[PDB]
Amino acid sequence: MGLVPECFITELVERDLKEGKYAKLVTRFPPEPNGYLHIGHARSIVLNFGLAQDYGGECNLRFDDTNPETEKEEYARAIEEDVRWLGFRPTRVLYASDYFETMYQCALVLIQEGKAYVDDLPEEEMSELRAQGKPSPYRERSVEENLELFERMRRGEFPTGSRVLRAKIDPAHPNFKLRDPVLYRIVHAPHYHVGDRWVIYPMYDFAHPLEDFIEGVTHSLCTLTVYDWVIENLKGKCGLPTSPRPHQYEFARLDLSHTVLSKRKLIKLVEGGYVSGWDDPRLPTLRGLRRRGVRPEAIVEFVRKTGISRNEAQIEMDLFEEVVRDDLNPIAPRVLGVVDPLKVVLTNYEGEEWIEAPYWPRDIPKEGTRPLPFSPELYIERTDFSLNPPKGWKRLAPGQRVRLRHAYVIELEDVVEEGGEVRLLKARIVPGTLGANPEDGVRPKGVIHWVSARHALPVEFRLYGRLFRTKDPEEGGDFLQNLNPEALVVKRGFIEPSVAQDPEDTRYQLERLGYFWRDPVDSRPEALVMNRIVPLK
Length: 537
Ligand SMILES: [Cl-]
What we know:
Elements: H1 8-18, E1 26-29, H2 41-54, E2 58-63, H3 73-85, E3 92-95, H4 100-112, E4 116-119, H5 123-132, H6 143-154, E5 164-167, E6 182-186, E7 200-202, H7 204-215, E8 219-223, H8 226-232, E9 247-251, H9 263-271, H10 286-292, H11 296-305, H12 317-328, E10 334-335, E11 337-338, E12 341-346, E13 353-358, E14 369-374, E15 377-381, E16 401-404, E17 409-418, E18 421-430, E19 447-448, E20 451-452, E21 457-464, E22 488-495, E23 507-510, E24 514-518, E25 528-534
Parallel strand pairs: 1-2, 2-3, 8-9, 10-23, 12-18, 16-19, 21-25
Antiparallel strand pairs: 4-5, 5-6, 6-7, 11-22, 12-15, 13-14, 15-20, 16-17, 17-18, 21-22, 23-24, 24-25
Helix pairs in contact: 7-8, 11-12
The structure holds chloride ion.
């Protein structure tokens, strides 16, 4: 039923809704269009749109775009793509920057009422004074002089960084952030959305409340005072409504083990070439995860399962992989492919045959079948063969027989070597071990996967592992020195031919290897390329 974990915020919203404090709930998700979203942002997405649908309310996708230097439309498009990918349907799509006029008007009002002033001091002097908690000399300029300067700022008469509009609050305030914080700055740069109209742009702390207020947001949810000051001094001006007013509430950042999320670090991994691109399945971007093969349902489940709170415990990657596995288990038909192929010839078998093999294990309700080709030549995993097997060895070796999955039992006859490593197995079927045990009672200790070398399809396999070996690379030192050099292994293996008649977005479990699907970018019917979404436990 209820999508968002019982937590501080549901109970809170429920209270306010029942008691009538707001008619509809109205949340927003506000990313800055200056990058790609990542698994962290999923929490803010699920929470904000989740809230809306649970309570018959509205949720705005809004680009908080007040930083003309970095922000681009493709980042916006990309954001919307990812939001809708997760299954969510913004009530509206909005751009902070379409409210730039209203914001500038709301500034005039501040200057008029003596609540803000232009500051000529250079940045380094402003912060030294702030640290001393003393006032700018320019702090007590008249209304008139300020309006005239701000206007000259608007016209682009001053260059970038040279002048700022600031709130007149308290420079000796115990809270640093309230020491006359900056409302407007100057950037001589064009904005991707609104073009060249503006040369002065509001700061986060001034634009955020106003964008909320303009939208009639009720609950403003951000991760872990100036906000209030902006609302309380402007309620009822510039034809913003006099009430109700939005209220900030705070949840904790998602910090996932074995993964970095800081945009600067991610930038270092792409640019550094440590990763092939922003949708690289090694990355925790939503792009990457999509292309990896994770389903939006698992990310949303992951997000729910982990809860919403002030509780900032680092989430274990095991959990995520665990969720992705559970996600796919009812819906990944089971097929057989081999990743590290060693050939196996059968000396006592001729011709071909096709076996009705089941897609689903006993315990999945689904029925389903495919013709699986058998022949005298197969590939098995090199790793399912030991010349010197350990005590628990359940697979092929010189003494031991082994179950070919869905097919015969076989036992080893000859091993052929070259360069001192192992290049081909000569083996024999134990007849008629098909669908049955061996006459002699000695069953194989184990079952291994395999394909017919006479029928199999080449596949390029991209085995993705976790990006880092250390639990906390994000705060650990040289995070680069913590990369997992196994993050991607590429092997050229083979898969059963059935897969050719599957829609291309099919996700498989390849038995005893993990979950896989055609990489949406590179794979082609005549040159398959499949990513391993996740291994088994
Ligand atoms: Cl079997």
